[PDB]
Design an enzyme around this catalytic site. Structure first.
Site, PDB file in Angstrom:
ATOM      1  N   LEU A   1      -0.861  -4.221   4.551  1.00  0.00           N
ATOM      2  CA  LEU A   1      -2.217  -3.706   4.429  1.00  0.00           C
ATOM      3  C   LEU A   1      -2.946  -4.405   3.290  1.00  0.00           C
ATOM      4  O   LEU A   1      -2.389  -4.590   2.203  1.00  0.00           O
ATOM      5  CB  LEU A   1      -2.206  -2.193   4.192  1.00  0.00           C
ATOM      6  CG  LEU A   1      -1.651  -1.340   5.334  1.00  0.00           C
ATOM      7  CD1 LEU A   1      -1.789   0.139   5.010  1.00  0.00           C
ATOM      8  CD2 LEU A   1      -2.339  -1.666   6.654  1.00  0.00           C
ATOM      9  N   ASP A   2      -4.192  -4.790   3.550  1.00  0.00           N
ATOM     10  CA  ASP A   2      -5.012  -5.487   2.573  1.00  0.00           C
ATOM     11  C   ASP A   2      -5.731  -4.482   1.676  1.00  0.00           C
ATOM     12  O   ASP A   2      -5.619  -3.265   1.840  1.00  0.00           O
ATOM     13  CB  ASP A   2      -6.009  -6.404   3.281  1.00  0.00           C
ATOM     14  CG  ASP A   2      -6.415  -7.591   2.430  1.00  0.00           C
ATOM     15  OD1 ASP A   2      -6.105  -7.595   1.220  1.00  0.00           O
ATOM     16  OD2 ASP A   2      -7.047  -8.522   2.972  1.00  0.00           O
ATOM     17  N   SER A   3      -6.486  -5.004   0.706  1.00  0.00           N
ATOM     18  CA  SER A   3      -7.222  -4.135  -0.207  1.00  0.00           C
ATOM     19  C   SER A   3      -8.217  -3.262   0.547  1.00  0.00           C
ATOM     20  O   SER A   3      -8.466  -2.115   0.161  1.00  0.00           O
ATOM     21  CB  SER A   3      -7.937  -4.978  -1.262  1.00  0.00           C
ATOM     22  OG  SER A   3      -7.030  -5.839  -1.927  1.00  0.00           O
TER      23      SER A   3
END
Ligand code: MG
Lengths: 115, 69, 69, 79, 125, 217, 107
Positions: free
Chosen positions: D37-39
């Site tokens: 998961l990205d920011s």
């Protein structure tokens, strides 16, 4: 006052109106009982070897007082169904398109600037 | 690439926070649309390109969510 | 000054005499009902008339600017 | 407060989230690497976590939680 | 009366899939409110457009004049221009192509508007 | 003492009473709305209500290029270029839907008509929409801007080089060869300026009007 | 038929005929118009190829272009003259041996 064989400017972001094929589009027909086309009047356009409908949104002929007289004859390309061919208009469009009889709301949605 | 990548996160947080109170608009659609806007543009960008993208988003926050109600 | 303001154009040149009479068009068949029937007599002076008489639709000068609210 | 309640609720709200696949929804599930998961993704996880419990905190450590137990523990000491 | 609250409720009742309401700034002189509504098929678009128009005439508007229905020739985009509100109804695919919501939300920072450029025409040589 | 052009009667066979009636209406409007002093070449901002919209006004900024009309029908045209599109609007001074007239920059130009700006380069017609008004000094004369514009290729809306137009604000040397200026002068009509029956003296008429306008105040 | 000279190019359009010629010439692999006229890698846009050939032949027109501020006459490379000359070399045969019916009606 757009007539048959008048050279007009496609004020739109549509592909057919791009500067390639420099030859300006020319009017084939004016959808009025008179052959004179003013703001809000549809016309038939000879563009890139195609026949396409266009809507006059500005012209150089003097009109009634309190209304904008432009420096070029402007048009927006219209599909057969009536949906505008291009998705954006950046040049100012007169506000008088709102009231006059016709189907102009679709074009006004596309244009940010009104003058 | 961005002015600050934390500012990118801050911008996204505020947009979701502001959208929480929308009534006339379809809240679910707004959340989905913002996600699409963030994902499509921000994944790959340059310094100049990202700066312009972030600036437009910043205008959205300070313009009453672009007139959305 | 006994000036009548009439819509549109009237035949003739300026300073030319014209004949003015109630309209004979069918729509305005009986308009004399609410006008001075023989004529208007200043001698009677039941109520001295204002200097200028206006139609309801006319926007009088000295009124506030028209805002289409 | 129900410390375990936070764990299951965090487990449950994360389970509710559809974009993440609960292939391994352990109490120590990482987000940058384990869930990829990205920011952008984590913030929306914060909102889902915040919405259930009532937020009352900034992103000071919400970004830093990086796993359900850490946030659960962080939700554990804030109430 | 016919107001924004009534219009959205009427749209909600007849199951409008996507509804967006934008309060246009007064500086922009087009309208007070801008509404965009998605619909499953052309049949659905015609029904709701007719339903709202029928309600509008029923719901007072005694002094206000009637409203034309625009785009009936088209099969994917219908727009009705009420005095203070303009509602544009279109099928899903048409919506993404034009992206009206971005234009009115981001007044002059719209991506497509930005891509357009101005030019000048000196001689070739 | 600046008398607005509209008040000056044009010569003809019209009765003077027709002008008295029109002046009374004109002065009454000026009480409600103040019409500032301006000349061709000055930049003005005009606010007008749009009938299409509801209680929503519009603002247009441009340089005044022509003044025409007498009496309650006086008009003025001001020009600007917006996103690279030239636009001119002709405004009726006494139209009831003009909310305000603001003289952003009061100045005078070499010519009393600037229709040649259509043929001049775009820079000379572009003006910032948000420009704030510049201060003006009462104890002065109106500044006379002596700018001479540069024209674009020869095909023009009119033959400005021709003597009838009497243009003094164009850099003709840059655009026209000395022979072309010579060839133009064949249209000169030199006798026009020296025949005394073509001159309309409004000095007494302008004088009598001034006290009448002041007296009503 | 217009490419074969059967149709007077002026009631079909020189430019449109030129585009079809380029379209057919590229598909058939006969890239012989990039050596008669130096076009380097070749192209698929008629405007681009017509630009180069107009430069090779040093032809210019004064053309009225319609812009926002008015009409201005601007010197321009002669696209129409390029199209007329480009078709001529095809008709002479120096641009290669072509069988138009090869693609649609190979039979
Ligand atoms: Mg002319």
């Amino acid at each position: 006052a757009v007539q048959k064989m008048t050279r007009v400017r496609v004020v739109d972001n549509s592909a057919l109106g791009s500067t390639p094929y420099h030859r300006p589009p020319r009017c084939i027909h004016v959808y009025n009982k008179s052959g004179v086309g003013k703001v809000g009047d549809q016309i038939l356009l000879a563009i890139r070897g195609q026949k396409k409908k266009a809507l006059i949104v500005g012209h150089r002929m003097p009109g009634s007082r309190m209304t904008p007289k432009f420096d070029s004859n402007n048009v927006v390309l219209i599909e057969d169904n009536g949906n505008p061919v291009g998705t954006r208009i950046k040049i100012p469009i007169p506000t008088s398109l709102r009231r006059r009889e016709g189907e102009y709301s679709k074009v006004l949605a596309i244009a940010q600037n009104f003058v | 690439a961005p002015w600050s990548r934390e500012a990118v996160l801050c911008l996204y947080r505020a947009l979701l926070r502001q959208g929480r109170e929308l009534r006339y608009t379809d809240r679910d659609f707004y959340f989905a649309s913002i996600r699409r806007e963030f994902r499509k543009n921000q994944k790959l960008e340059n310094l100049e390109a990202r700066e312009k993208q972030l600036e437009k988003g910043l205008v959205f926050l300070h313009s009453k969510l672009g007139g959305l109600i | 000054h006994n000036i009548i303001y009439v819509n549109g154009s009237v035949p003739g040149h300026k300073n030319c005499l014209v004949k003015i009479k109630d309209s004979t068009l069918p729509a305005y068949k009986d308009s004399c009902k609410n006008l001075p029937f023989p004529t208007y007599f200043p001698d009677g002076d039941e109520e001295e008339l204002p200097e200028d008489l206006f139609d309801e639709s006319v926007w009088q000068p000295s009124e506030p600017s028209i805002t289409f609210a | 407060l129900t410390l375990d309640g936070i764990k299951d609720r965090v487990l449950y709200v994360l389970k509710l989230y559809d974009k993440i696949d609960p292939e391994k929804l352990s109490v120590n599930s990482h987000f940058m690497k384990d869930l990829g998961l990205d920011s952008l993704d984590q913030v929306e996880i914060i909102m889902a976590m915040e919405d259930e419990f009532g937020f009352e905190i900034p992103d000071i450590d919400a970004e830093k939680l990086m796993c359900p137990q850490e946030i659960v523990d962080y939700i554990a000491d804030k109430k | 009366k016919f107001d924004i609250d009534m219009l959205v409720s009427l749209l909600r009742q007849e199951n409008a899939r996507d509804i967006c309401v934008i309060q246009v700034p007064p500086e922009m002189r087009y309208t007070d409110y801008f509404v965009i509504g998605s619909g499953t098929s052309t049949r659905h678009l015609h029904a709701m457009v007719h339903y709202l128009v029928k309600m509008y005439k029923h719901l007072k508007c005694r002094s206000d004049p009637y409203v034309k229905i625009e785009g009936k020739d088209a099969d994917d985009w219908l727009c009705v221009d009420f005095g203070s509100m303009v509602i544009h109804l279109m099928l899903p695919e048409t919506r993404e192509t034009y992206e009206l919501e971005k234009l009115w939300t981001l007044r002059s920072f719209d991506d497509q508007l930005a891509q357009i450029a101005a030019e000048t025409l000196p001689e070739d040589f | 003492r600046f008398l607005s052009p509209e008040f000056i009667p044009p010569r003809g066979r019209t009765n003077p009473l027709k002008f008295k009636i029109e002046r009374k209406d004109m002065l009454d409007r000026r009480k409600v709305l103040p019409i500032p002093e301006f000349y061709v070449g000055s930049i003005l901002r005009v606010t007008t209500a749009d009938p299409y919209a509801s209680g929503k006004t519009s603002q247009f900024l441009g340089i005044c290029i022509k003044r025409s009309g007498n009496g309650l029908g006086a008009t003025f045209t001001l020009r600007n270029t917006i996103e690279g599109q030239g636009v001119e609007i002709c405004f009726e001074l006494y139209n009831p839907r003009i909310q305000e007239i603001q003289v952003v920059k009061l100045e005078k130009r070499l010519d009393d008509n600037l229709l040649y700006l259509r043929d001049a380069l775009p820079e000379y017609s572009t003006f910032d929409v948000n420009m704030k008004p510049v201060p003006q000094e009462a104890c002065q004369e109106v500044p006379v801007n002596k700018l001479k514009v540069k024209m674009k290729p020869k095909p023009w809306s009119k033959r400005w080089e021709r003597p009838n137009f009497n243009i003094k604000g164009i850099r003709f040397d840059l655009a026209l060869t000395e022979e072309q200026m010579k060839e133009a002068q064949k249209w000169n009509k030199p006798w026009i300026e020296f025949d005394m029956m073509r001159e309309y003296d409004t000095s007494k008429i302008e004088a009598a009007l001034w006290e009448e306008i002041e007296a009503s105040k | 038929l217009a490419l074969c000279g059967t149709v007077l190019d002026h009631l079909v359009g020189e430019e449109t005929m030129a585009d079809y010629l380029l379209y057919t010439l590229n598909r058939h692999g006969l890239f012989g118009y990039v050596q008669h006229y130096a076009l380097a890698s070749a192209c698929d846009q008629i405007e681009w190829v017509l630009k180069n050939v107009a430069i090779k032949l040093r032809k210019t027109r004064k053309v009225k272009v319609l812009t926002g501020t008015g009409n201005v006459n601007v010197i321009q490379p002669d696209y129409a003259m390029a199209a007329r000359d480009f078709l001529r070399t095809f008709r002479s045969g120096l641009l290669g041996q072509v069988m138009l019916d090869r693609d649609i009606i190979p039979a």
